[PDB]
A paper describes a structure:
The preferential binding of hu3S193 to tumor cells with high surface densities of Ley and lack of binding to normal tissues expressing lower levels of Ley suggests that this antibody is involved in carbohydrate cluster recognition as a first step in tumor cell killing. Herein we report three-dimensional structures of both the free (unliganded) and bound (Ley tetrasaccharide) hu3S193 Fab in the same orthorhombic P212121 crystals, which were grown in the presence of divalent zinc ions.
The Fab2 binding site is contains a few solvent molecules and a glycerol (GOL) molecule, which is weakly held in place by a single water-mediated hydrogen bond. Overlays of the hu3S193 Fab structures (two in complex with Ley and one unliganded Fab) demonstrate almost identical positions for all binding site residues in contact with the Ley tetrasaccharide. Comparison of the free and bound Fabs shows that the binding site of hu3S193 does not undergo significant changes during complex formation. The only notable difference is the absence in the Fab1-Ley complex of a single hydrogen bond between Asn 28L (ND2 atom) and the Ley-specific Fuc (O4 atom) saccharide unit (ie., the α1–2 linked Fuc). Without the Ley ligand, the hu3S193 binding site contained 4 ordered water molecules and a glycerol. One water molecule in the unliganded hu3S193 binding site occupied a location (near tyrosines 32H and 33H) where the N-acetyl group of the Ley tetrasaccharide binds and could have been displaced during complex formation. For the present complex (Fab1-Ley) that was determined at a resolution of 2.5 Å, we identified two of the same bridging water molecules and these were buried in the carbohydrate-antibody interface.
Numbering used by the authors:
A (entry chain L): 1 to 216
B (entry chain H), D (entry chain A): 1 to 219
C (entry chain B): 1 to 222
The structure:
C-alpha cells in the first residue's frame, strides 16, 4: 500500500513562470529489476490523462520539452520551465514499481492573471419550459478573474436560499478567466407568484455589486 | 495509428453485473500487457487491473479483487473487464490503457466508457432555449444558450452548430439536483449587433439514454 | 472578452455588390482603427482597408480603391465593407480585425466570412457513403467516411455525429475537378472490433446551395 | 512598391530544434514616427491568423516567450527557440510602416519525425453514385510520414493515368503524420467494363508497394 503524496494540492503562477510539483512515496519505489517506474500524467475535464514523464525522467514522445521530471528514493518532482495557459490541468504522479500500482492525489494548476470584471446576463424561464411545470432562471458571469465571486438571488427583494445552484468552468486556456452560471429553480405556480427576479454579483473587478433583472 | 475504444458502460443496479469491452488497433495487441483504470466522479485516477500479453498473469487492487475479472481475446484485439457485485462506489469512467515496450504504463488511452451503479433508471434530458434578449445583453455583448435539464446518469455532451461554433462557448459542468437528476447549462456570447445574422443550434447528446436533441435558439 | 463576427459574405456574379458587416463586443469600438483583411483560396493574406475610430480617415490597397468602401457605426459596434463591381479575383475569405493602442495592427480577428465572385452557377454536393468493409479494414483498423462530390463554390463544412465524433477523423482539402466543380472526402478510422459499437453520420453543410445533409454510413460489401 | 520577401517557402525541423524565418523589405520600413511596425503572424488552415510579434520584437500577450522577433534595415527575423508539434502552421510577416501595407508570401513550417508507414484502405463506389452515371473509387493513406508517397491506380492490371485526384491533410498537430486520399473517377459504363480495381502504394515506410483491391461484385 505505497501511498503517493503530491504538493501542493494546487498552485497558481504567471504565464512564463517556472513551476514544480513534488511527489513522495511512503516507501522506496525501485522495482526489483532496478528501474524506478515513477510517471507523470496530465488531465483535463472529460478527457483521458496524457502521459508526460515515465521512469522518472523520460519524456514521452510528443510531450513539450518545457516539462521534465526528476528525483530518486522517496521524493520526486515534476517541473514546467515556462508555464503557459494550456498547462491549466490536473497533474498526477504514478508508481508502477510495486503492486498495487498507485496514483498521487493530483495537483491542480491555475494561471495568475490580472483581475477582470465579469459580464452579467440573466435569463428568464423559457415559455416551453413553463408548460413543463417548472421554471428555471439562469444568471451568467462571463470571463472574470479571480474565481471568487458572490451571486445572490432576489425575488421581490427577498434574498433566496437553498433554491439555486452554481457551476464554474475550468480556467480558460486562452485569457485564463472563469465563467459561472447560477440557476434558480422554482415550480411554475411559485414562479408565477412573483414579479421581480434578479441576481446580484459581487466581484473584485466590480467597483460595487452589479445587478441584473427583469419582471416579465 | 494507435486507437483504443471502450464500450459496455451503462447504468446497472447494485449487486448486478456489467461487462466492459476494449477494442484496439494500430499495434500488435498480443505483444502488450493491457490495463484498466477508472476515475470516480470528481475524484483522482485509480488503477483497476492488468493482464499479461500471454500467460494470463493478472492482478488487481483490493477494492475490486474478487469481483472484477480482466480477460482478453488476442484474436480480436479485445480486452474485457467483467464486473460482478457492483457497488455505487464503482461508479465512474473506465479507461482502457496500453504502455510502451520500454517502461511506461499508460501511454495510450481509450475515450473511456461510463459506468453508473445505481438503482435509478436512465433519463433523457429536456432541452430549453436560453434566448438572447435585452436582458441577456450587456457590454455590447449578447448571451444565448441551452438548458439541459433533468437527466441521468452522467454524462451529457454539447456542441454548437455541429461543432462549428466554439468561440465564446462555455459548457458548464453538470450539477446534481435534489431530485437526484443532473442539470446542465451551455452558453455562448456574441456581439449583440450581430443577432439575427447567424443561426445558433445546440447539439445535445446524452448517450446513456440514446437521446439526441438539436435545439435551435432564437432571439 | 473581445469578440468579432463577420457576415454578409456570399456568392455573387461579376459586377454585383455585396455588403459585409463586422459586429464587435468586448472593447470600446469608437476607440480603435478597424481593418478588413482577406485571403484568396490557397493564397496569402492581403490588407484590404482601414478606418479611423473617428474622422472618417480611410485608405485601401490599389487593387480595391474605388470599388470597396469601408465605413462604421460607432453606435452599433459595427464595421462595414461595401463591395461594388466585384471581380472573380475578389474571391476569398474576408476577415475583420482590430489592433492595440500601442502599435499593433491585427491583434484580434473575426472568424471570417466567405465571398465568391463567379459567373459559374452555384451547385450543391452529393453525399455518398464510404462504407466500411474488409477492404476498408487493415491492421485491425476499419475505415469509413463520406464523399462530398461536385459542388461549387467553396466552402463545405463537414462534421461527424453533430460534432460528437472527432477522433481519427480526416477531412481532406477540397480539390477542384476538371468539370469545374469541387470535391472532398471526410473519413475516420476505428478499431475493427468496434463498428456497430456506435453509428456514424456525416453532416454536410454547403451554405451557398442551402445544403445541410446528414448521411449515415453503414457496413457492406465483402 | 515595397515588396516583402519571406524565406524559406517552407522548412522542416525536429521537435525542440531552433527555427529562423526571415523577411526582407524592398525599402527601409521605419515609420515617419521612428518605429518599425514589422509584425509576425501564425495561421492554421480554415482559421484566422494569430498575432505573435509586433513593433519588430514586442511579443503579443499570451504568446510563449519561445517565439521572438528581431532585425532592421531590410532584414527581419522570426525565431522559435524550441519547435513544438503545435507550431506546425504558416507564418507571415507584415509591414505597417510605409503605405501600402503588405504581407510576406508566408512560410510553411513542418516537423521532422521518424518514418511512419501508411495504412491503406480502398472503397468501391456506392450504389447511389453508380445510378448517377459515374463511379468514384477512393484509396486512403492513413497517418504516415514523410509526406512523399506514390499512389497508383491499376484496373485489371492496366496502370491508370490522368483520371484521379489526390488530396493531403495538413501535417497532424500531434503525431506529425499525414493522411491522403486518391480518387479514381470513371463513368458507370467504363467502370462496369472491368473486374479488379486496385491502388498500389509506394512509400518510404514500405519494403514493397502495398496493394489494396476488390472485384466489382465480391472478393
Ligand atoms: C510490451 C510489453 O507488454 N512488455 C512486457 C513488460 O511490460 C512492460 O514493462 C513494464 C515494466 C511496464 O512498463 C509495462 O506497462 C510494459 O508494457 C512486462 O513487464 C512486467 O509488467 C508488469 C505490468 O506492470 C509488471 O510491472 C511486472 O513487474 C513487469 O515485469 C518486470 O519488468 C520486466 C521488464 C522484466 O524485467 C521482469 O522480469 C520484471 O519482473 C514483461 C513481463 O515481465 O513482459 C513484457 O516484456
Ligand atoms: Zn415564492
Ligand atoms: Zn466567455
Ligand atoms: Zn488517422
Ligand atoms: Zn475502361
Amino acid at each position: 500500500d505505497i501511498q503517493m503524496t503530491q504538493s501542493p494540492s494546487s498552485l497558481s503562477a504567471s504565464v512564463g513562470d517556472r513551476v514544480t510539483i513534488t511527489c513522495r512515496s511512503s516507501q522506496r519505489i525501485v522495482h526489483s529489476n532496478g528501474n524506478t517506474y515513477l510517471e507523470w500524467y496530465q488531465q483535463t475535464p472529460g478527457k483521458a490523462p496524457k502521459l508526460l514523464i515515465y521512469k522518472v525522467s523520460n519524456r514521452f514522445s510528443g510531450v513539450p520539452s518545457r516539462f521534465s521530471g526528476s528525483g530518486s528514493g522517496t521524493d520526486f518532482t515534476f517541473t514546467i520551465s515556462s508555464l503557459q495557459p494550456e498547462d491549466i490541468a490536473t497533474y498526477y504522479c504514478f508508481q508502477g514499481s510495486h503492486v498495487p500500482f498507485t496514483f498521487g492525489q493530483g495537483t491542480k494548476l491555475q494561471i495568475t492573471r490580472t483581475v477582470a470584471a465579469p459580464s452579467v446576463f440573466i435569463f428568464p424561464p423559457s415559455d416551453e419550459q413553463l408548460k413543463s411545470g417548472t421554471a428555471s432562471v439562469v444568471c451568467l458571469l462571463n470571463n472574470f478573474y479571480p474565481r471568487e465571486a458572490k451571486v445572490q438571488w432576489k425575488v421581490d427583494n427577498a434574498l433566496q436560499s437553498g433554491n439555486s445552484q452554481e457551476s464554474v468552468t475550468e480556467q480558460d486556456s486562452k485569457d485564463s478567466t472563469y465563467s459561472l452560471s447560477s440557476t434558480l429553480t422554482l415550480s411554475k405556480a411559485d414562479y408565477e407568484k412573483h414579479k421581480v427576479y434578479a441576481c446580484e454579483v459581487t466581484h473584485q473587478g466590480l467597483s460595487s455589486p452589479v445587478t441584473k433583472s427583469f419582471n416579465r | 495509428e494507435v486507437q483504443l475504444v471502450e464500450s459496455g458502460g451503462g447504468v446497472v443496479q447494485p449487486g448486478r453485473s456489467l461487462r466492459l469491452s476494449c477494442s484496439t488497433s494500430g499495434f500488435t495487441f498480443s505483444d502488450y500487457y493491457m490495463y484498466w483504470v477508472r476515475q470516480a466522479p470528481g475524484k483522482g485516477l485509480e488503477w483497476v487491473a492488468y493482464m499479461s500479453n500471454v500467460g494470463a498473469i493478472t492482478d488487481y487492487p483490493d477494492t475490486v479483487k474478487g469481483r472484477f475479472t480482466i480477460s482478453r481475446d488476442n484474436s480480436k484485439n479485445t480486452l474485457f473487464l467483467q464486473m460482478d457485485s457492483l457497488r455505487p462506489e464503482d461508479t465512474g469512467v473506465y479507461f482502457c490503457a496500453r504502455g510502451t515496450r520500454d517502461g511506461s504504463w499508460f501511454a495510450y488511452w481509450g475515450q473511456g466508457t461510463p459506468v453508473t451503479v445505481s438503482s435509478a433508471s436512465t433519463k433523457g434530458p429536456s432541452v430549453f432555449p436560453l434566448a438572447p434578449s435585452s436582458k441577456s445583453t450587456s457590454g455590447g455583448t449578447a448571451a444565448l444558450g441551452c438548458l439541459v435539464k433533468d437527466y441521468f446518469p452522467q454524462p451529457v455532451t454539447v456542441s454548437w452548430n455541429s461543432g462549428a461554433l466554439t468561440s465564446g462557448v462555455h459548457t458548464f459542468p453538470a450539477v446534481l439536483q435534489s431530485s437526484g437528476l443532473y442539470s446542465l447549462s451551455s452558453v455562448v456570447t456574441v456581439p449583440s449587433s450581430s443577432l439575427g445574422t447567424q443561426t445558433y443550434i445546440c447539439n445535445v447528446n446524452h448517450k446513456p439514454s440514446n437521446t439526441k436533441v438539436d435545439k435551435k435558439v432564437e432571439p
